[model samples]
Target chain A: GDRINTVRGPITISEAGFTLTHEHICGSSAGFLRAWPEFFGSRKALAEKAVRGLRRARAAGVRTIVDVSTFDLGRDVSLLAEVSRAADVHIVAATGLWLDPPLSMRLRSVEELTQFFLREIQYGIEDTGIRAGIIKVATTGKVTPFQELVLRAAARASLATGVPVTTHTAASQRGGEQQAAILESEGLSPSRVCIGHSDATDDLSYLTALAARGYLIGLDSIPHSAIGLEDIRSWQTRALLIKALIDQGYTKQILVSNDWLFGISSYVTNIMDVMDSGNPDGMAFIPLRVIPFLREKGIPQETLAGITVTNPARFLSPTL
Target chain B: GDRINTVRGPITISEAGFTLTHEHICGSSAGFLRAWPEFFGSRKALAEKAVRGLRRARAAGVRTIVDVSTFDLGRDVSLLAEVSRAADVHIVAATGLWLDPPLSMRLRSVEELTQFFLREIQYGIEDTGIRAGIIKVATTGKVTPFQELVLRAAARASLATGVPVTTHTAASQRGGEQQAAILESEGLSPSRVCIGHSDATDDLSYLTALAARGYLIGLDSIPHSAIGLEDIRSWQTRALLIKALIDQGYTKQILVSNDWLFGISSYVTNIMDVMDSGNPDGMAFIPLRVIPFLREKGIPQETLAGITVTNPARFLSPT
Candidate 1:
């Protein structure tokens, strides 16, 4: 059970060095593709741009990254495999639903949703032979009934496949607690879940409470000013928060990433540029900039390595 | 209450003359389109072919035809409106799910399915502004669990919109009885339901039983030898069945047409060609051949009018 399913194939978890847990190589609205496929632009150009971004991240000593794009978010497993080969980076793909699933998917039952996820993990995504290594789920401000159904299904898929689950949350609303509670109710250990986007807020008490419950606190969105209002925190503030969590003896329960995107649709171009300005280094921001900043913040080398390498490897280890 | 919604616009029920209740102008797998849009061929060519076939039907005195294609079955309201305008026929489009729906649709709840169908009928299909005039559902052999959910959803949409319901059935298996019973259980009047493909078999008792329950028996599949074993019955046998019902004074409860198609996907090309050979008249098979044959069978002129004209008008009449 030490193997991690990557876009290239399964590799030992020990090979997953300096991993970025939550990111997307390409993201767009699935409905847009269905309604007007002509507007999808050039796939070759998109893949080339993705290769450039991934090579930059790899050059900075980041060996692996998880592409957590779901079906409703334009998850192209075939494209992920192509880019992984070009960039020489291990890309762990995901299998799960997104917030805005299609009308047909919205009508599906929870059991059906679980089976859909299991099929991707056990076999491959569609007919592509590239097995998904992780599961992703999302909830906005509060846990709506539909979002609750998806969370429960993700937990069930995790228990059945042993793939760890990552999530999206509105940090200001403290929705991670509800997500963790739902996963726990479904018999999943808190260690198997990563409460994502927890860095959007600077609340130490809430972060510690989740870390104390044995959940991995994901400070995934490193430096963003325009992720709506909740994510206006600067990189300096985010670095201070992570240093405080480590200082409070919670280093083992932390995961970090930039939540960067290499290729997104034209519809979200303005918003993406606005958000990218805060983290100008993109995927290289964590490895090149944030690591040095944390070093200057009086953090031990081993603790920094745990946040960058050891934690992701242990979190992504296969469960048998 | 008496407005019959069409791809063109609303019309009086009396304007629904000599209607064919179940057909498709064009059909393809929606998944194929989504996965590879480049292989969809030319949209302009497909539209032109559809307009030509519909014009042929209009020339034969058929005033209206229902395109019963569902979303998964390539139901395109925008293309349908385009063809209707070019062909000058009142094409009443459908709003319902197909038998082999996508895996995503199969997982949806009955309540969700009802809402999806109601949205198309009440507002419009997508942004086309062309309202659906009828509901279509199907079951083969026996009704499976998923098929039952769709059946109930179709009945709910029928009651909510007052649009009549049409169905597809395996006649040799007597599938019409189960369809009628389910629609009746959902509070839909038997008169508002059409048990389709009933002409595929010559079993008098089963056909009479469905007719006796006040449901319109769809003798729709005319002169097709390649629908496999179930539909190998000749056009003469179908004529005899319609003549027998007319002789029994049930002329008001019969509908007739050839379930012809202009284009379908490659999956059905071999079977479609085999079926087309037996009914060479294509969409004009009823007026160009079947009606004259029925007249020669000694059926009364008024009864012939009822089966071809009056019965269809009543069945497609808006609630």
Candidate 2:
């Protein structure tokens, strides 16, 4: 019985019901929260909004959420712990770095990078005993040499801790291929890696090939990427892509979530506030919107069960 | 009466005795304290070492120390507050950026940059209510467009808050001149600006010219920069330079300190631990070492008092 590390504590794999494989409580620049608390409005109001959103997620039967907000991506596990407690839901925070990891990374050795992740995974995350349950790394359209170093470090960390590796990629450049290759070269099985943001491409060849090779195809950018396309039918197109993958016998390899954020330090817009045009349901887009669309298009309820529930359980299990 | 904001709270200018203008309790990457505590060893050992160093300065009749550890350089005023309590020496922290400001600065406006410094000055730094007492900005070989933005922002911040501005410069290029010009352009009095690390150059021409223009010539970077020269006579050369400045009627325009640190996250050396040959006195170098050298070379005690005490007091005061 392998236990999963949640913000609250460890829980059995069977208890990780209805997990969202990718999402964020807040976005980049965790430093802003400490140095400029005004950047995110008020901490209390941010918490209130976060709790309200999580309750909606809980209502949608979302028992677990894996926040891949890495160290550089401003992963504040202290905030995560409070949000989990207030929302009464299990949250799995991450250990690793995100895209364009500060120039300081250039001087850090590969082992040092690995140690950065290992400390959070083993000891705890920044003044809290909350352990990270996943390792995340990101690459641009082309995997640069620096990005490869981080990929290898993530691979080494996952191997050391028996944790799963999730990643962000620019799919059009076939980013996942280089990412998976580097992780595999460092001795991670494809099954141990989740290729996130796979929906950024409609090129099923790229998505299916990785799925065929045992990598978890993360349909994580559901309604978010659709908004970027400026096409109303983009969400429908992604739901059909989900059907196409299931028809190809890859239902067990699918995971979904919206990369929606309650707030981001960068947008410089009131993104943390209102719900206007693009993402109306926010985190509920997958449960309240996407799932019914899938069911209508005749995605088998049992198959949906595997994609939304059973698949994540077995993928997240250490024994797998 | 002019009051100065120290880590403990507010104090009058007269209370800021014998101040060390340029120093650090620790150097860049204050983030390491939280993200990687192991990077600097145990917190207790670092704190103990800082207290021990502050005690030595106190023994040297030093009362106030300005830790120009800017926000980007890892200014943790909470730690400063505790060190001030434990060591019983008034510590003045800073608000500003350092080196190449972060890439994020490109997105932030000058007013936003000014606001970042203002919040720390008016409200507090990080979680503690310990407000910063000084503003610091840096310029390299040549002031780039981005560096210009920060210099202007620091200038604006000082003017708005009635706080003084201190700066770092690459003296080989006479970096202080450009930095001073930008501040003066922003309508700041040269008296409110201290051009630091001026010891990096003996081009006495640049030093005297800035002093003549009413800028405080920071003859700081005593033993640390000397060590970088890998020459035993380097510290002597700097002492002579200080003598020349005072002789030229600029004692009130002089400040001295060892840019030496109890520790830095980058040096990756045990700087916080034992004393080696280079910077043996740590923070006490001026009182325990350099000032004695200057006194031995015919610099009067009253003049040294003006340089070390009255000068820093008046420089730090907010009327």
Candidate 3:
């Protein structure tokens, strides 16, 4: 295994392998939505689906899954580890609070939270040897003081642990810049940060500005994960947005994944039963299907590889 | 008449005094364009015109002006002080750098620039006693590491000297939040920061977000200063931007200024002859028409007083 182990953990890069930069192996949706509480019990079957999904991903040539889902978001590292060893795929789990509204208001102070994150990355979560592969942060919109405190703490933890950061953003065009500004102000380099779910912004200029400023922009929504046909239309529009960003010499700043979990039938059903619709089925929006859509839209195969594999691999690797 | 001295200097609120929170007294475009050879002798005439512009502003009810033109891009502060004293309207000048593509590359280290600015602000610009009223910083579209460094230096100076900062942003869309982040990171508060040219972005979401962050937002582009129109038109557009921001619950954070200039004709001419029609008549984008446009745009007599009169009065008076 030509893998290098820094203080954080072991990281390996290989040819003939794809990396899933975004994933949720074991997580239920936040209980804010009425459907979540009702739906929580049904997801016991998701552990089986997770094993199935990992095998499917392994069969599709993805050797690494950077599962950026964690604490307070129901990320089961034990389950993730079991599935990773079972499926022969390296699953890198995360450690941080979710940015769901309830979680946001109830989060600990930056110092306390940084300690929480550092414990997971340094001591490991309950001694299972699954250290945080990347630090996770989420913002509701513009960096609120509370969220800024959390991100500031997460950044300090990253500085201490040598793990990079990835963030979830609300549906706003300037979320990437706002998040990056707050992080950089706390002394995090844009090189060490990834702004997640940035594909929802329809404005290409906004996306390009963020990428130009040295942020890795995340376009992780599944094609069917969007809200109906209009969402599909926006997803295609985002392909065009990615194309424009790529054209602007920002190829290194692009990364894509389906922030999908099999337990969410509303999202996973569309993938599992895609033949019911006019589209194709089975892992419909994972790297396997996303590549075809990107190819049809004229994204070169080389660029696609960089987006799904090389970019996230480098982003997560500790600085030399 | 009731404005408090918010910074160090000699200025007080008076009914007859007109205060330009944003203005440029003298500078050459060649200095900004990096084409310094083109207008080698432009400073003298520009200085003279600034003096005349100051006198005219005094007559038109302005007693103080915060000349926002910064250093190295042809900032002739000695000449500016002469004009200010001669015209009898107290001028509160700026100390910082501009963000033009060319000048941005030419600026020195942030610490170096801030030290230069502190000398001007603390000792009164070579002992002439004409102190800088506020500090200024400029940013490209998104805040870069270098820009944050400059802002950090400015915040350090502000924390040390108790002066406030105003910034000229690429669009001012995220200007307040960005500036606040930089300042707060340096342990400075939002009350000490002001964002300039916020209206240029045209998106209410950006403007409102900045306003909500507790920093002051100024929409100071003279109509002709941007897409090229007259002072009346520039003022008119600024008034509308102000009205929109105020209606969106950002009135308390609002500060309005003409961002007018005296001898920066190259900048003015381009704005006037926006279509390149070779029109000198387009140069009336200053002094003659801004306030009337504000009045016409329903910017409230009292609201205009706060930005132009009371705010500047409080900002420049000796603390």
Candidate 4:
């Protein structure tokens, strides 16, 4: 009954790990299929590469990485198990639906989605000996039928699995209401859900509103140049937001991520762009950008750590 | 060279007084006409009521009350002039279509609506002395084509008049994007428009989103019962929302009001029903329900002032 320890298929064990709150080991829908078709051709080649990636992760002091790709849209836990075994990196796969119009209606209904999610939770991550670490869902830039249904599924899955849920909010402004409505309807605890992509709105009111709901508000646009220089100016936005949340006595409920999907080639371009922009302050230069900015802005290291590592670690910890 | 005050008629010597951010000396729409048919009957009784309402307002420490009733519905400036003369309350009247169903396609295009709004800005309320204090527009509870057109008109009018505009947003969640998109397209600064009825949705994130854009966020709905107890627990909702906004450090962008139409007898019943529901502690108790609840919730006195007086004062001051 303990959800964490049921090793079923191929199991991977890692040592001295830093559980990454957000990362994509397997590529997203378009890329995952392109990389590996039918998990057969060059299967051994791909498996070896995944193992090498895990070794690099282990060397970098990364222990567990939450692979945030949602269900059926290319969630191959069989691949996850293979990589976990080869490289010894704790791989926690996600279970939910994606937000785009194409994948929005993959489930028949909220009930069907919830049931499928429950099966994943009970059976462990696709017989790969890894249980889903957290529930996942997403919304478009606006509230659509697909998002509404996915939210329902996530809420119920959180209830069944006792696992926290996270969301991909299309636009930042709707973060508070979109998440609140679903959580309230499902009677799920607000603490269990993370409202992701909150930085996109640049609106403090939006961030504040979501923070008040006691959910982890994700400020994950680190090191991505697509956000532009004005986007980086949003560091002040984050400061005011964090300061306000802290002042209002709600400090315990914030989290951060780069929302980095590094293996994607475009992400690689973003990395190079950050380097090209020439981190003038030198303090701003880092493989990961958000933490240093937070540090420069005087966000206490403890608070920064809370947002970056500790809070996220607690969120996915099965014991919590 | 001021725009027409949709909230006030032409100002007479008797009309010069303190401007009220919230008041209803006249009809806001035909929806309110039946209950106060005397408004449509003879101009005399309508004038008397407006006079009485303004006097009561004056007694309550208000000098000018912007009459927010719009055009194409039941805005009669002649009666408003008489009432302004009698009550000694500065009546800042408004001009614009009365929201939704297009009122009549023959009225004006979105561009023409801007022209009409400009005419009001350039002249006193309908060729009278009363100058408009600000502009007002509204959105329905749902986002539809009509609502978008109305917002487009409002945005254009605001840009043309240089007068800040206020909108009646759908109490639900649908109106946010449509209203924001229209106003942005018209090139109206977000700070120039006040998005009203933010309390309708059980979500504070929507308000902050607009607030982030520098638009004035109005948390009206003090007297409306349709929002239910879950919503009427205004203290917690307001505290949480306000604290969240305060935390975000955008206090200047926030505004609050009862949006009370006291003359509407049903309003009293509706407010009483919410109070009786016993949802929020001390909410059912009156004597300035919203303010007192906000106070009890530990909201700073200054914040309350901003919500009740300061922010709104500045919002309407430009007019």
What are the chain A TM-scores of the candidates, in order?
Answer: 0.94, 0.95, 0.83, 0.75
User: For candidate 3, what is the total of clashing residue pairs?
Assistant: 8
lDDT of each candidate versus the true structure: 0.78, 0.80, 0.62, 0.55
**B1-319 per-residue lDDT for model 3 (tens digits):** 2332212345445632556677766544212212111122344565566666667667666766677766533455666666766777666677665653122223346665566567667765433455666888888767887788778888888877777788887754465667777789888767677788776766777777777876777776654344444433443555577778767876667766666655442332333234323222222333356556667766677776666665654544433
Tens-digit lDDT track for model 2 on B59-175? 988898999987666667777888888999999989887773433444567777888888889999877888988998877969888778888888888888888888898758989
Ordering by lDDT: 2, 1, 3, 4
Worst lDDT run of 10 residues, candidate 2 chain B, spans: B267-276
Ranking by TM-score: 2, 1, 3, 4
Question: For candidate 3, what is the lDDT?
Answer: 0.62
Worst 10 residues of 1 chain B by lDDT: B31-40
Q: In candidate 4, what are the lDDT values of residues B4-110, reduced to their tens digit?
A: 24334433323333333434444333222321233224345555645664565556545555556564334545566667667665656665554522212223356
Task: Write out the backbone clash pairs for model 1.
Answer: A107-B108, A108-B107
Candidate 3 vs 4: which has more lDDT? 3
Error of 4 at A221 (Å): 2.7
Error of 1 at B172 (Å): 37
The reply for model 1, stretches above 4 Å from the true place, is: A31-40, A226-231, A266-269, A276-278, B1-319
Error (Å) of candidate 4 at residue B146 is 34
TM-score for each predicted model, relative to the true structure: 0.56, 0.92, 0.45, 0.42
Give one digit per residue, the lDDT tens place, for model 3 in A130-177: 677688888877677877877888889888866888888864546777
